[PDB]
Design an enzyme around this catalytic site. Structure first.
Site, PDB file in Angstrom:
ATOM      1  N   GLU A 131      13.786  51.425 -24.590  1.00  0.00           N
ATOM      2  CA  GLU A 131      14.742  50.832 -25.422  1.00  0.00           C
ATOM      3  C   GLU A 131      15.078  51.387 -26.815  1.00  0.00           C
ATOM      4  O   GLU A 131      15.396  50.825 -27.579  1.00  0.00           O
ATOM      5  CB  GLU A 131      14.498  49.280 -25.587  1.00  0.00           C
ATOM      6  N   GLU A 239      11.209  46.767 -13.758  1.00  0.00           N
ATOM      7  CA  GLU A 239      11.121  45.174 -14.194  1.00  0.00           C
ATOM      8  C   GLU A 239      12.175  44.307 -13.479  1.00  0.00           C
ATOM      9  O   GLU A 239      12.712  43.474 -14.062  1.00  0.00           O
ATOM     10  CB  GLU A 239      11.099  45.089 -15.724  1.00  0.00           C
TER      11      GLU A 239
END
Length: 329
Positions: A131, A239
């Protein structure tokens, strides 16, 4: 009751995020039967595995590695460089001042070398940087301690360090919403720049924190796979889960899924897993962010204390309809 991993053995790994207690009871039995990959949900975050300058905490991850070896599984490394997950000692010299560029790089090198040495025997893929792409605005990259101190090279350097110590493990950039229009092209541009400068990046992680209401999900998924694949990258779904709530839907009243939510969920899961199978030549691992609905981060994010039902097994450890639709091929 087919084994999910066995059903998908000629397509890709099937993984699940875990805590130490997921290795016990019903969840451990589900792991043993259905999954051939584990991701430590929290215990390999910098601040968990390396909380102090002179102290690592390997206890939980050692138990997952022991578990994986006994039960014929491999692990994903999660994560080296991730905003808000690095303890403050890393960035500070004794006076509380920012460390030098040279020293921050060396601390990262020592961290990655320590973690890779211990676990490279069991880890097949590392989320090296997580991220880094800016989410809120049009800019490319977020502000961070790494970027302030090292500069934009911190991403490439992190990959170069992991390359030295990871053995045969593959190196990934990992992010959420990286299939959506506002983020995909930016992210493609970033990765192209890194790859052109010879950053040793092997693939991109598509977190896939999704929900049953997203109209554009399938078309977004295909376009992201196409763009990332066109750079020569391998793709891992890292995820995956499937909220019954749009992200801005913060309602707390539901005690169980409303009518049609579970069938809709099963339909969407069926569709995404058909896409996964469709682009199987480039997708090498599919990991769920949890085992069963009894234990999911979605119960407290984005709303503290309200129940969600996002995984393939329900609150009783039993397979939901989604499970049966994705083994139907």
């Amino acid at each position: 009751i087919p084994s999910l991993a066995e059903k998908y053995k000629e397509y890709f790994k099937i993984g699940a995020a875990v805590t130490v207690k997921d290795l016990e009871g019903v969840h451990g039995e589900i792991l043993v039967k259905h999954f051939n990959s584990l991701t430590p949900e929290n215990d390999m975050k910098f601040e968990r595995i390396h909380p102090d300058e002179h102290r690592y905490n390997f206890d939980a991850v050692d138990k997952m590695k022991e578990f994986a070896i006994k039960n014929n599984m491999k692990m994903r490394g999660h994560t080296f460089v991730w905003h808000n997950q690095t303890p403050e000692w890393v960035f500070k010299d004794r006076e509380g001042n920012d460390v030098s560029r040279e020293l921050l790089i060396e601390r990262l090198r020592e961290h990655i070398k320590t973690v890779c040495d211990r676990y490279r025997d069991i880890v097949y893929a590392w989320d090296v940087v997580n991220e880094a792409v800016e989410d809120k605005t049009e800019k490319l990259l977020r502000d961070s301690n790494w970027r302030r101190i090292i500069g934009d090279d911190y991403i490439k350097i992190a990959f170069e360090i992991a390359k030295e110590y990871a053995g045969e493990g593959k190196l990934f950039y990992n992010d959420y919403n990286n299939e959506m229009p506002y983020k995909l092209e930016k992210t493609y541009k970033l990765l192209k720049e890194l790859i052109d400068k010879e950053t040793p990046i092997d693939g991109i992680g598509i977190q896939a924190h999704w929900n049953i209401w997203d109209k554009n999900l399938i078309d977004n998924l295909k376009r992201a796979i196409e763009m990332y694949a066109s750079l020569g990258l391998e793709i891992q779904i890292t995820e995956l889960d499937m909220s019954v709530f749009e992200f801005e839907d913060r309602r707390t009243d539901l005690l169980e899924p409303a009518e049609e939510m579970m069938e809709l969920q099963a339909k969407v899961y069926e569709d995404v897993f058909k896409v996964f199978r469709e682009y199987k030549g480039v997708i090498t691992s599919v990991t769920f962010w949890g085992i069963s609905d009894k234990h999911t981060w979605k119960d407290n994010f984005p709303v503290i204390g309200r129940k969600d039902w996002p995984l393939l097994f329900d609150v009783n450890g039993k397979p939901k309809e989604a499970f049966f639709r994705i083994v139907n091929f």
